[PDB]
Design an enzyme around this catalytic site. Sequence first.
Site, mmCIF file in Angstrom:
data_model
loop_
_atom_site.group_PDB
_atom_site.id
_atom_site.type_symbol
_atom_site.label_atom_id
_atom_site.label_comp_id
_atom_site.label_asym_id
_atom_site.label_seq_id
_atom_site.Cartn_x
_atom_site.Cartn_y
_atom_site.Cartn_z
ATOM 1 N N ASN B 109 -12.610 1.580 1.184
ATOM 2 C CA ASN B 109 -11.632 1.056 1.890
ATOM 3 C C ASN B 109 -12.409 0.262 2.998
ATOM 4 O O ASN B 109 -11.452 -0.378 3.854
ATOM 5 C CB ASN B 109 -10.717 2.066 2.570
ATOM 6 N N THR G 1 -13.549 3.981 6.461
ATOM 7 C CA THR G 1 -12.519 3.273 7.391
ATOM 8 C C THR G 1 -12.982 2.690 8.644
ATOM 9 O O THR G 1 -13.328 3.373 9.404
ATOM 10 C CB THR G 1 -11.331 4.484 7.965
ATOM 11 N N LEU G 2 -12.626 1.288 8.730
ATOM 12 C CA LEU G 2 -13.172 0.347 9.929
ATOM 13 C C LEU G 2 -12.078 0.829 10.917
ATOM 14 O O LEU G 2 -12.550 0.773 12.300
ATOM 15 C CB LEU G 2 -13.008 -1.112 9.374
ATOM 16 N N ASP G 59 -7.395 9.207 6.309
ATOM 17 C CA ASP G 59 -8.174 9.733 6.756
ATOM 18 C C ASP G 59 -7.599 11.313 6.835
ATOM 19 O O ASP G 59 -8.563 12.355 6.356
ATOM 20 C CB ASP G 59 -8.983 9.549 8.100
#
Lengths: 216, 216, 213, 211, 211, 206, 230, 195, 195
Positions: B109, G1-2, G59
């Site tokens: 992701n 995950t940015l 998350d």
Amino acid sequence: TTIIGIIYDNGVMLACDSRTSTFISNKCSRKINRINENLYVCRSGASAHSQKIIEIIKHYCVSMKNENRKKGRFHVTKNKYFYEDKFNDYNPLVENVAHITKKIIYTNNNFLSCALIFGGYDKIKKQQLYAVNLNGSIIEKHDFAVSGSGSIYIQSYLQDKYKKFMTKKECFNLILNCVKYAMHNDNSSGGLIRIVNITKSFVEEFTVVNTQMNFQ
Amino acid sequence: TTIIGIIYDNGVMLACDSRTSTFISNKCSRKINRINENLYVCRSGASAHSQKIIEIIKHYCVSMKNENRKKGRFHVTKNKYFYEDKFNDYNPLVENVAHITKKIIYTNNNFLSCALIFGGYDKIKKQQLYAVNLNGSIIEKHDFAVSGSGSIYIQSYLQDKYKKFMTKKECFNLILNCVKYAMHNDNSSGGLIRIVNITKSFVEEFTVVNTQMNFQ
Amino acid sequence: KRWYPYIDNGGTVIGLTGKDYVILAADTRLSLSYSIYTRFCPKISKLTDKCIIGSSGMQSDIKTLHSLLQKKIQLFVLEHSHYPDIHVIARLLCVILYSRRFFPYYAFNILAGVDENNKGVLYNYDSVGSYCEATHSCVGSGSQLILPILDNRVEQKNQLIKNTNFNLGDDINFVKDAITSATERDIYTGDKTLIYVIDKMGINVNTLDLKQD
Amino acid sequence: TTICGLVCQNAVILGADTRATEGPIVADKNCSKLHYISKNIWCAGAGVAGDLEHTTLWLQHNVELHRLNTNTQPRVSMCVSRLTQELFKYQGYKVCAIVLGGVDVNGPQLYGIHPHGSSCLLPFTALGSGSLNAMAVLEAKYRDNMTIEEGKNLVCEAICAGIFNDLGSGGNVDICVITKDSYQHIRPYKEPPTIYPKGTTPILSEKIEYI
Amino acid sequence: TTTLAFKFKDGIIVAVDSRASMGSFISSQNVEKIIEINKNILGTMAGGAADCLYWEKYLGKIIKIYELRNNEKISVRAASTILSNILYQYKGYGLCCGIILSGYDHTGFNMFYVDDSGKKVEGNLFSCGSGSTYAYSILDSAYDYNLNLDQAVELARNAIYHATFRDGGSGGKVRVFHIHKNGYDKIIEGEDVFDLHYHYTNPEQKDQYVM
Amino acid sequence: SIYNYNGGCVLGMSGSNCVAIACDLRLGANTFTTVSTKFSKIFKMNNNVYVGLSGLATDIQTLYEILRYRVNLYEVRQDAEMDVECFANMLSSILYSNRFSPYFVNPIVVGFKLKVNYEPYLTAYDLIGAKCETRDFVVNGVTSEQLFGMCESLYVKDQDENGLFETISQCLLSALDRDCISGWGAEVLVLTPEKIIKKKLKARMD
Amino acid sequence: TLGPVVTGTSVIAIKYKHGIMIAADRKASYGSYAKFQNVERIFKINNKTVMGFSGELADAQYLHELLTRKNINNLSEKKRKEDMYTPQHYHSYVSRVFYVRKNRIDPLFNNIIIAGINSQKYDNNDDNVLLYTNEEYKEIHKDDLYIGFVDMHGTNFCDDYITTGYARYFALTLLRDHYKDNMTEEEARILINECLRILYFRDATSSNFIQIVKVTSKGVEYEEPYILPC
Amino acid sequence: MDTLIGLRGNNFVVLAADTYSINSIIKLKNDDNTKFYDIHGNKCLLLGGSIGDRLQFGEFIRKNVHLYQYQNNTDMFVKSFAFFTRKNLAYYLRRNPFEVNCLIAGYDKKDGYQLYWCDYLSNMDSVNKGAHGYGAYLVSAILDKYYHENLTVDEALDIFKLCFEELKKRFLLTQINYELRIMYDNKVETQYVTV
Amino acid sequence: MDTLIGLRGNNFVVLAADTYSINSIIKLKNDDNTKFYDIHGNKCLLLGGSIGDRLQFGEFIRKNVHLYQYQNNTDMFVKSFAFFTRKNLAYYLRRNPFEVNCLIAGYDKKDGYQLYWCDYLSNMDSVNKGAHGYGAYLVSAILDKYYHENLTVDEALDIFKLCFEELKKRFLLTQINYELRIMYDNKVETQYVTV
Ligand SMILES: O=C(NCc1nc(-c2ccc(C(F)(F)F)cc2)cs1)[C@H]1CCCN(C(=O)CO[C@H]2CCCNC2)C1
């Protein structure tokens, strides 16, 4: 923010939410502003920018109204007002106020980020909706106008339910349901729903408490 | 892009536009992809990313289906296919395929920007819709799911018109009107409308030419 | 935007040596920006019966570092069959901190103890492992407030008339006054302070309430 | 900083803490944050220290000039218009988040003014770093019609919540009860060393000059 | 920081201040900036205290292993080469060291300047740190090879004093060590440079000294 | 970082019928090179009004010249000494007049308010004239944290002139010993209604 | 995950006389879009341990899967009820996971509450555990109850009450003012409902559709979700 | 790059500077004369920095002080000259700054011999000794060491010889040629020192 | 900043460099010895650039050429030495570059006296004359003007004297001290020239 205008058979109804700003700084706001007794405008975008635009255009409208006077003699909680200018002798035209607002926005469109919906009544063109876009382009809408973050969520819905010659009751129901759905889907819009119905001879301002019920 | 899924009585419909990319690279595309005879998925977002995800998950689905086999003996233009696996003996569950897709998206992701809607039928949970979001979160929808740029324009409209136990006919009409309105409002969505109706024992695939007519 | 991996959770740790004792007082407030996570999060960890460590900085790094030092001390005891004194633990802490030289623990540390010869000992450490012994030290948000006070009281460099005779009780009261001043002038220091006294009989803990605003 | 304002029956109650901070350091333990604008108008500031002080002085003296010229009691909306026009004259800079509370012929009016020049008439509000802590208490306990003493108690609770929950807030509680007839500014409303020997400091020179 | 070393008739003088700072704040003034690498080699600290301390003790470990394996004392040249190669291998990772390694070996008295960039320079006179230029100017003005031990020690003390007087990064106490053929001696273990100003430049102390 | 170029710090403290101001004497250059050790940051405006300007030395001199000009014009026009509170408000207005191009200075004002009763008066500023009045002490400069700690620990209410001198001198010296870019001598002025005692402390030169 | 995309808002957990009461609205927002409004954000770890999250949903779901398999592996090795992992064990595990991910600069964009009952001396629910199928409440000492917080940087602690997200300002002020030991279920419910009412009025990402979960002597009970009264 | 040095005693002031004109990597001259600006009435402005800025500011100050002295028919005091120079340098600081470093030397009957150190930020103070440029770092301590109040002019010149030799030995720019202004006994003298 | 000069004739090659070791603004030594790297068998590598990179690359190439000559018991040819040096410099160019400029001089019976110019980018070529550093800009034309194929070694040294005097006169770094390697008649000689 959600702001909506709908022309019906004998008037124009404007409607808006009340939420301001993840943190809600204010939950009882006035996005619909009275420019003149026959002319209201809905705001969306930056708040200080739009509010100073409202003050400037109120000044312009007062100047125009004073200059429009000829010499001599001639001829669910609601709050209703009858026009002092019964014959529309000197109230400014809605097109004039909307166009000077467009001029002021376009002249300062480098930094101004404001989208307005003017609604009103005059004796020439009867009831009118004008949409002043972000860069200062003006489009007259003869059926409805919508703006703000929430309005997108109801676009097709409004396009499904609008009729050409709606009555007061069904237009009121449509605009209330539209703002309710927009508030349900949009986090940035919420709180009590303010509606302003503008007609030939009076304006009535409604306040509505709301809840969205569905078993979809 | 507009992609929609709706659960109706003993079935689940999926629907999509066909437009790809101000310049339209393709106007006859297949955003709905057949993963298995009982399982389809709708794509939205980056095209190459989503397509390689479809290929990887088809590989996973084939591996799972081959491994699911037990030893021994047991027991408007449409295109209709009956399931080879009549009893759902070895077709993979929709939850399993949707969750491995969620795992692959979440693991990658950082760069993957893809939102998927899985629709399908299995004997355990009957008809299911799953929505895999951009970062790789999975939510099972029991009424409907929508994704893509155009879907926002119909969010209230579908929410107004959905019923809990719609028939095949009215669900077909609703999903077709939803994609039509989304195409009318969204520049990024257009072209012929593809619909896939997934049921207990067969899958229908409809193609629709469209036009939006209104005197609003 | 890239995620910044360091946060200062605030609060102060003061250390003061005696002839045969050492005092280490740490506030217990845990904060994030201008909000308070909790009013009780101890900064001081016991390492041996004659050595403790206090730290200020990121609470996750502080907790992990203290647990790591405790685990390595227990491993030392099991392997070499003697408790390491403060100097051994000090070199060990220096090596541990320098092992993450290019991604350091976000913590400034004070290692307080009483060595084999019954001498109060106090080492102070920056993040990357540079360290030195001192007779008085302070780390955390209030350190720039309190280090001049400790210099004035302990060394008396700019005082011709010098009173260099201190005992344990006066040192305890002075450390209380110092942490009170830090609480008054530092937003991140307050609520409560745990004061550890190490001397011949061992470690003794006491509590003092501080302002909560 | 924690500042709050509310509207009670025929009165406005403003309240504030008394902490000013130079970053982590408490720079002033008894700073006064409730500012006089007129007899019937008061305000509090939550932004750039300087901008608030000089803007409040400018507003106060210009309002006094307007009162002298026109002879009428000042209006809160005039102060709002002057403040918002001045703040919008600068493109977002000269940041001043103000709670402006007064009583005039139109009644008791409380306004929240943002640094960009947007105003909002409100029944209550809070500003500063501890604004959310105060707003929790206010939204829990506020009711439309309250006595002056009840409003004072609620203001005190909101400011104390900000004092005890926000690190940028501390000290005493200031309040100001503004009515049409007068104001009551209660500054200390609530409040939740070594001597060296003579000659110890060494000197190089001394010079005595008589005034 | 200011460190210096120079070769002279009776061996090597090494001298240092004792200040350590974090930006503008003085973190300490009791820092020991001269490390016994072995019985005959001393090493100075300048720049990153962590890197200098760690890698000089690491060099001491390597030298101990070498001397134990070979039954022979290492040369200053070989130790400097080992340190320079170790510091060069971490090029680009932000190590900050400026080190003077000085000692006595079988080839006589030797002195090398090594920094984090792989530099390795043999000489008879070096200075490092923020006050290095001042110590260089004083030493170069007054340096002579045939100085006696007292004269050399006094010159080193004076150079460190003037560096601390001009440089904000240097101060605290001056230490002066003397390396000879059979180890080293701490001639000045630590001397507060407060007294050195009122010895050298303002001995009479009736007024503030005017630079 | 502009305040780190020269360094410098100013302090003020109040006692009973007496007040004191103090400053370091360094003029630095590029944050580490000391170039003067007599650069006094205290300036007399009148017998009951003193100002301590810390920050960039050019702005210290420019602001002192502006303040001297304004005070002299006020006093010659009115034929009386300027009130300390009037001076403090004037300094606030002058600093705010340059809001978008400020003088990089952090002043304190120390003096006696006249009522004859001589009340101590202390106030500290930011660079744009935001002022805070205090009854106990005021601090500005790069050494502000150390000065705040020392004054918080050591300040004693209503000290006489000698006790005030010792306390303010010890506060200043202890705070300066922990600052790289300030020190190199210390000036201490102690004002009482009859006289002024100017002293130069035997300070560190590091 | 940015960064966060689909986000859950505040969670509020408190100790009361019969155990833990943990609350969260069932909304997950896609930025300003209230896309999902029937999401579960309080996860059962075991019969005496629950987990709640604020922040990114992906998350949180990954962490939930990790804790699920940790519980299953714990159950496989179990021989007596004392072998079951406690809430503090899971809190330490989650803190370590967050710490390592912080070290490699790959954080989980979440604030996590781990809550439950530390002691096995109140029930025999762990003697015969049922994963796939679900008398009066016993009074439990607060020392035997556990509530623990973790953030993105791994800052971890415990307290008698914990809040996440916007509840750290709105709910936590009222909690610090009004919380008291040994509250009944009714008092805890009233306090939580008041906190969620303030959050509903002032947090734009919140909803009035609440999920309440109780950890008591009879295990983990998911209450029927309700609209906030009045 | 332009090393300036100044030393003030009770009976003299001495200024000195390297005589190099630099253009990128080449020395245009080894006998530069764009640094010293002698003003009428026992006054000297020694400027460093960019040559164009040096010329503009030095001639501006010189033509202003000469205009003052001819308009008023008096010699401007050295303190007034120094503070006028600082005021004008600070006026341009926020509008097109002159990137010039200054030593201002002079003699008055009112105040005797006077030296002022002033940097490109217009931070000025009176000093007994001062220096500018990178070479300042290598000379200042020498000026600190060998200075005393009762220096003769010859002893001051010996100190300047030590400074020049250190600038040759240790400084990266091996500056060899120097010019010196000696103000003493109501006379202004020019000297040139090689090595 | 490290000026290197090389001149090759029919019966000699000569290399020269300033003997300065620099650390920020201070010359650590006026007799630096970290530039020349004499290899066994009539070969010399004269390196410029940063001192640490010079030491690492110089020592490296020297120990690599000595290992070759001891393993094979022969003297490596100068062409092989130069191209080996270029190959190793280019190998590290895209992985931790050595910021060093090289003149590679030697004598062979196969190819006589040889000079190679090579920069920090490993762009190499054989030349009769070459230079490196900023000072190259002030010496190269002199090497172009006074060079001829049948120069004696003394005439070449006179040309180098002209180069050193021009570097003193015109270059911003007044480089005074120089070291020279003279390879001729099967001998390698060291010379030191001041001014
Ligand atoms: O100097 C201070 N105390 C005394 C100390 N001396 C040292 C030390 C001194 C010299 C050496 C050596 F050279 F001899 F080896 C080695 C270590 C470390 S500590 C404080 C001054 C203000 C800043 N400060 C803080 O702690 C601020 O809080 C930090 C916590 C975490 C990161 N963010 C902010 C330290």
